[PDB]
Design a protein around this ligand. Structure first.
Ligand SMILES: Cc1cc2nc3c(=O)[nH]c(=O)nc-3n(C[C@H](O)[C@H](O)[C@H](O)COP(=O)(O)OP(=O)(O)OC[C@H]3O[C@@H](n4cnc5c(N)ncnc54)[C@H](O)[C@@H]3O)c2cc1C
Ligand SMILES: Cc1cc2nc3c(=O)[nH]c(=O)nc-3n(C[C@H](O)[C@H](O)[C@H](O)COP(=O)(O)OP(=O)(O)OC[C@H]3O[C@@H](n4cnc5c(N)ncnc54)[C@H](O)[C@@H]3O)c2cc1C
Lengths: 622, 622
C-alpha cells in the first residue's frame, strides 16, 4: 500500500502545467514525483496547433527566462513563424508559431524524461489524504498510495467532462481519452465551490481532397524569429505556407435553416460560426484559414469554422466553400463541458487558503489556452518546492510579470468568461515587454536556484554589454562647429545650435540606433544586436518608465499590508453591509488587493486601516 | 444519420491488422474507409518493442513481398538488428530488430495518412446492421452510420477487456486506453461462440537509476541485414546496445514467500517468472534483458521478468538484482483479459461461415503477436475488396506461405493456447524460406493488383538475373586433364576423374558459391548477391524440393474437393457417431482439411467420398 520512499512534491497530471511544475521542482533540488494517466501524450495539443500570440508570447518568454521548457520545445517543432505588430512600437510585438505536433510532443517527452531528481509514474488518482487541514499523500487506482509534503493538481479539463455533439453527449476527457470521474466527487467534498464551463473545436479536413490550386497562400517573415534566449534559427525544421478561403451566402442560409438543432439558441464574444452569422447578420463574408498539422501528415486544421451543429450541417458547410467542393472529414468537431474551481479561495501563490499544502494550476483555475497553464504550473511547483523545504514562498507583482497580473485578475475579477490574456489587460505594458523578460526574471530565478550556469553566464555577458554600451554612449559630445558636424546636420533636422551629445542626439524620435552607429563618432555597434535593442528601448522610454516606477513605489506599503484569511469583517465598525459581505466573500490577501475589488471605496480602506491599527494586527502602515 | 457516400470496404480498428487491411483494400482500387477510436495511436506497440524473430520474420517478409507496410516502417525505426541461426542452414535463419517506438509510430501514421482511395475517421462503433445473413453498414457512437458492401473487424484486445493487478481489476483496453464494452454484447448476439483469454506484461524501469557500469553489453551484426526487398542499410538510425543481468536466491525467496497474493496458484509453457521458479525449483539463475525503448527516451524495458504479483513484490524483485540496488519504476506491470471468437466458424478466407460479408482478423482470432495480425488483416482486406468487386476470393495453401499454415492450423487445431507461430510448426520449411517469399508471392500480388511498378520492375530484373545465372552455370564443362584443373583438384577433395561441370561441381557440400565464382572458369559472380544466393539454395536443395513438390501435387484433388457449410453429416451412412459429431462441430471446407482433423481416419474420408459420389455433390474426384 504505502510506497517505501517519501517524496518532496507530487504533481498529479503531466499536461501543459504539470510538466512545468515537475521541471521547476526537480531543477530546484527536490525529489519530485509526477503521476499521469498515460505516457506518449506528454505535450499533446488538443486544439489549434499554434504557440504564442498577443498576450501569449509574453507568458512563453516569462517561462523561458525563468527556466521553462515550452520555449525550447517549439524551436524544434515550428513549421511557420511570424511577428505580430512588427510595424508598431516594440512594447506590443508578439511572436506566433504554427507548430508541427509530433516534433513538439517528442521534444517535450525527451526533455522531461531525462530530468535529474524527478521520477514519472503512469497511474490515475482516485482520492487524497487530508487531516487537520493538511494534505499528505495521494491514492492511486490499483491500491498503491504515496506520501509527500506537497501536492499540486493539474487535472485540466479531465475533471468529469462530457463531449457534446449536436444534442447528444457522452463521457470523455477529450477526443480519444477517458474521463476522471471519481476525483471530481472527491474534490467536491473539499471546501471548494465548483462550476462547469464548455468550449468546442472544429473538425479536421484531408489535405489531399482540397484543390489548393485556386486558394490564396500566406507566408511568414523571411528571417525566422526564435522564442528562447538561447537557441537560434538553425534549429527550425522546414517551413510550410498557409491557405486562406472564405464563405458565401449558401453557408449562411444552411446555418440559419438548420439552427434549430443546437443546444443553444456565453462569452461576450462569438466563439462559434453560427454566432458569427446571427450576431452580425448583415456581413456576408468570413475568413477561414487552412493550415497543416505538420510537415509529414495531410490533416488540415480549419481555423474560424468552429461550431456545435450536427454532422450533416458540418458537412454542408465544408462542402459549400470555394476550393472545398469535394472535401472529406477525418475528425468531427465537438464541444466539451468540464468542472472548475472559482479562483477566490486560494492565495496568490496558487495555494488553497483553507488547506495547507494543496495547490491548483491549469484549466481548473478557470482559464484557457496553452500559455495560460504553463506559468501557473511553474509557479505552483516553485511554491510547493519552497514550502516542502521550509522556506518562505514567492509571488510576482503586477509590475514585474504578466504572471502577477494573471494571478491578481483571477483572484479579484469575479466574471464568468474563460480567462484569456490580452496585452491591454495589464496596466504596465510599457515595461512588461518580451525582450526584457530575462532582465527582470533571471536574477530571481538564480536566487531561487531555477537557473543553471549557461543562462547565468549568458545573462552576465548581456548585462555587461548593456552597461558598457550605456557608458560609451554617455561618453560622447558634439558641437555645431565640429569638423564632422556638417554631415550630422545634413541628415538630421534642426541642426546643432549648442553642445550636443549622443545620449541627447538620439532623443529625436526620427533617428534610430543603427543609423547613429554608422557615423564618424559613435563607433560601430556591438555585434550582439539583441543587447543593442535594449539601450534604444531604454532611451526612448526613459520618461514613461521613470513615471511608472515612482508610481509603483508608492503603493508598496499597501502591497505589503497582509490580511489573514481568518479575519471576520463582521467585527469591524463603520463599514456598510454590502461591503462587509463583499469582503467576506472575496477574502483578499492585502489591502491593495482589496482596493482593486469593484465596490470598495477609499473610505472603506481607511476604516479598515483604522480597525487594523486598533487591533494591533499591523506593525505599521507607512 | 446515413452518410451520403457508400464505400466498398469498411475496416473497424486501425491497429496492426486494420492498417494492413486498409492499405491492401485501397491499393487495389476500391474506396476504403477506416474507423478508429483515436489517432496518433496508429502503430503503437503495447508490448516488447521488438519486430521479427523465429516464425515472425517470415510473416513480415510475406507481408512485405505482397505490398505490406510493417517491413517498411521498421527500416526507419530499428535501433538494433540481429540474425538468429546465422550459422545454420539458410532455411531457418530469422531477422530480429529492437525498434525505436516513436519512429515506428510516425512512419506508420505518415505512410497510412497519404494513401489514395482510402479515408480515415475517428469514431467508435456501437452496433452492426444485418439482414438475411448479410452485413451491410455499421453504427457509430454519435449517431452517424455508414453503408458498405463489406466489413472487417480488427478490434484486437479491446472487446471488453479488464486490467488485472494482483487480486484487483478495473476496466481498460490496455494501459491508458478505454474499453469497447457494448460491441462485445452486440457481437454476442451474432452466431459466434465467444471465450476469454488473459496475458500480462512486466513493468518499465528508469535508465538513469541503473548502474550499467557493471552490466554486460550485447551487440548485433556489423554487416546489417534488411527486411524489405527495396530498402538498404542507409535508412537505419543510430544503434544502441542491450544490457544483460541475472537473478539470485533472494528474489526466489521473496517470490515463494509472497506467492499467496496471486490470482493463480494456462499455456503449456511458463510466461511469468513465479511460474519459472515453481515449475523448475532446482534452477537458481535466470537471464534478464534490459533494452532501451528508443534512442531519445530513458525508459528501459525488462524482458524475462513478467509477473502478476502485487506492486510490493515487483519492487522487491527489481531491487534484489545486481545493478538494480536503487531502481525506479515508471510503469507498473499488469495483465489483461479479453474476449475472442473460436476460429472454427469462419472460412479459410477469414470470412464467417454463417454471415455474408463479415470478416475477422487480429487477436479476436485467438492469436498473439504483432506479426500474427498483419498477415490476417492483409488477407481479410484482400478478400473483402475482391468480394465487394464481385470476383472470386483467394486463400493461400500450406505449401506456398506461412499464412496458409497459420489459417489452416487456426481452423483445425482446437487447442486453447494463444497461437504462436514457430518454424517447426510448418511441414514445408525447406521451401517456405524468407529470401524467396517475393519469388512465390509477388506474381500473385501483381495478378490481384497489390504490387506497383517499382516492385514489378525489381522482381523482373531479379528473375532475369536468376535465369541467366542458372543458364551460364549450366553451360560449363571441365575435364581432369584441363589446363586449369590442377588448382581445381588442389583445393577440392576427390580430384576429377571424368568430365566435370559446375552444376555438378558445386554438388559437393564443402564447396560454396563465392569460392567457385573466384576461379579460372566461372567468371566473376553477378553484382547482386541477393539474386546470387538463390541459385546456391536451389542447387543445394533441389532433391528435397523435387520430392516435396511431387508430394504436394498428389493432394491437390483433396485440396480442391470442397464441402459446403450446409452439409448435415447426420445424413451419411456408415460413419461412427463420434466422427459425425466431430465433423458437425468443425465443419471443414475441404476433404483434405477434414482429413487433417484429429480423430478421423481414411475409412471415414472414403465413406464420405462414396456418399458425395452418390449425392452428386462432386463433379469428379481424380
Ligand atoms: C474541445 C476542446 C476545445 C478547446 N477550446 C479551446 C479554446 O476555445 N481556446 C483555447 O485557448 N484552448 C482551447 N482548447 C485547448 C485547451 O485549453 C488545452 O488543450 C488544455 O486544456 C490546457 O492544458 P492544461 O495543462 O491546462 O490541461 P490538460 O492538457 O487537459 O491537462 C491534462 C493532462 O494531465 C493529465 N492528468 C489530468 N488529470 C490527471 C489525474 N487526475 N491523474 C493523472 N494525470 C492526470 C492528463 O493525462 C493529461 O496529460 C480546447 C481543447 C479541447 C479539447
Ligand atoms: C497486458 C498485455 C500483455 C501482452 N502480452 C503479450 C504477450 O505476451 N505476447 C505478445 O506477443 N503480445 C502481447 N501483448 C500485445 C498484444 O497482445 C498483441 O501482440 C498486439 O497488440 C495485437 O494488436 P492488434 O492490432 O491485433 O489489436 P489491439 O492493439 O489490441 O487493438 C487494435 C486496434 O483497433 C482499434 N479498435 C478496436 N476496436 C475498435 C472499434 N470498435 N472501433 C474502432 N477502432 C477499434 C484499437 O483502438 C487498436 O488501435 C500484450 C498486450 C498487453 C496490453
Amino acid at each position: 500500500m504505502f510506497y517505501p520512499d517519501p517524496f518532496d512534491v507530487i504533481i498529479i497530471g503531466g499536461g501543459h502545467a504539470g510538466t512545468e511544475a515537475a521541471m521547476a521542482a526537480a531543477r530546484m533540488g527536490q525529489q519530485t514525483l509526477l503521476l499521469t494517466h498515460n505516457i506518449d501524450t506528454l505535450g499533446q495539443m488538443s486544439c489549434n496547433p499554434a504557440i504564442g500570440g498577443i498576450g501569449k508570447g509574453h507568458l512563453v518568454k516569462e517561462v523561458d527566462a525563468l527556466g521553462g521548457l515550452m520555449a525550447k520545445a517549439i524551436d524544434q517543432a515550428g513549421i511557420q513563424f511570424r511577428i505580430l505588430n512588427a510595424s508598431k512600437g516594440p512594447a506590443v510585438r508578439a511572436t506566433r508559431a504554427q507548430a508541427d505536433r509530433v516534433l513538439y510532443r517528442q521534444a517535450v517527452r525527451t526533455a522531461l524524461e531525462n530530468q535529474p531528481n524527478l521520477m514519472i509514474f503512469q497511474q490515475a488518482v482516485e482520492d487524497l489524504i487530508v487531516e487537520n487541514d493538511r494534505v499528505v499523500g495521494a491514492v492511486t487506482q490499483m491500491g498503491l498510495k504515496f506520501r509527500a509534503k506537497a501536492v499540486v493538481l493539474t487535472v485540466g479539463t479531465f475533471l468529469d467532462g462530457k463531449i457534446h455533439i449536436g444534442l447528444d453527449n457522452y463521457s470523455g476527457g477529450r477526443a480519444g481519452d477517458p474521463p476522471s470521474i471519481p476525483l471530481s466527487r472527491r474534490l467536491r467534498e473539499l471546501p471548494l465551490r465548483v462550476g462547469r464551463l464548455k468550449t468546442g473545436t472544429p473538425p479536421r479536413i484531408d489535405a489531399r481532397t482540397i484543390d489548393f490550386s485556386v486558394l490564396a497562400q500566406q507566408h511568414g517573415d523571411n528571417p525566422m524569429p526564435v522564442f528562447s534566449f538561447m537557441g537560434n534559427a538553425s534549429q527550425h525544421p522546414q517551413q510550410v505556407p498557409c491557405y486562406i478561403t472564405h464563405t458565401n451566402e449558401k453557408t449562411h442560409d444552411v446555418i440559419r435553416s438548420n439552427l434549430d438543432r443546437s443546444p443553444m439558441y456565453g462569452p461576450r464574444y462569438c466563439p462559434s460560426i453560427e454566432d458569427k452569422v446571427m450576431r452580425f447578420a448583415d456581413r456576408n463574408q468570413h475568413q477561414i484559414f487552412l493550415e497543416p498539422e505538420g510537415l509529414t501528415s495531410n490533416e488540415i486544421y480549419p481555423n474560424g469554422i468552429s461550431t456545435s451543429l450536427p454532422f450533416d450541417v458540418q458537412m454542408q458547410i465544408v462542402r459549400s466553400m470555394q476550393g472545398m467542393e469535394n472535401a472529406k472529414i477525418v475528425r468531427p468537431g465537438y464541444a466539451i463541458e468540464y468542472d472548475f474551481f472559482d479562483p477566490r479561495d486560494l492565495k496568490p501563490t496558487l495555494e488553497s487558503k483553507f488547506i495547507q499544502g494543496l495547490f491548483f494550476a491549469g484549466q481548473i483555475n478557470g482559464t484557457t489556452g496553452y500559455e495560460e497553464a504553463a506559468a501557473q504550473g511553474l509557479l505552483a511547483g516553485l511554491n510547493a518546492a519552497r514550502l516542502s523545504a521550509d522556506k518562505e514562498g514567492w509571488a510576482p507583482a503586477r509590475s514585474q510579470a504578466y504572471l502577477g497580473v494573471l494571478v491578481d485578475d483571477l483572484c479579484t475579477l469575479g466574471t464568468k468568461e474563460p480567462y484569456r490574456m490580452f496585452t491591454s489587460r495589464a496596466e504596465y505594458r510599457l515595461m512588461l515587454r518580451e525582450d526584457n523578460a530575462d532582465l527582470r526574471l533571471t536574477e530571481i530565478g538564480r536566487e531561487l536556484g531555477l537557473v543553471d550556469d549557461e543562462r547565468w553566464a549568458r545573462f552576465n555577458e548581456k548585462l555587461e554589454n548593456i552597461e558598457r554600451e550605456r557608458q560609451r554612449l554617455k561618453s560622447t559630445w558634439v558641437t555645431p562647429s565640429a569638423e564632422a558636424a556638417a554631415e550630422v546636420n545634413a541628415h538630421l533636422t534642426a541642426p546643432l545650435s549648442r553642445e550636443a551629445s549622443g545620449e541627447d542626439l538620439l532623443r529625436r524620435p526620427e533617428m534610430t540606433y543603427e543609423k547613429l552607429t554608422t557615423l564618424t563618432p559613435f563607433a560601430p555597434a556591438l555585434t550582439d544586436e539583441q543587447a543593442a535593442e535594449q539601450v534604444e528601448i531604454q532611451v526612448k522610454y526613459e520618461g514613461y518608465i521613470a513615471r511608472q516606477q515612482d508610481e509603483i513605489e508608492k503603493q508598496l506599503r499597501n502591497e505589503n499590508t497582509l490580511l489573514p484569511a481568518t479575519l471576520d469583517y463582521r467585527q469591524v465598525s463603520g463599514l456598510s453591509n454590502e461591503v462587509i459581505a463583499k469582503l467576506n466573500d472575496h477574502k483578499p490577501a492585502s489591502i491593495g488587493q482589496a482596493s482593486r475589488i469593484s465596490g470598495v471605496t477609499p473610505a472603506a480602506i481607511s476604516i479598515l486601516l483604522v480597525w487594523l491599527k486598533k487591533q494591533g494586527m499591523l506593525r505599521r502602515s507607512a
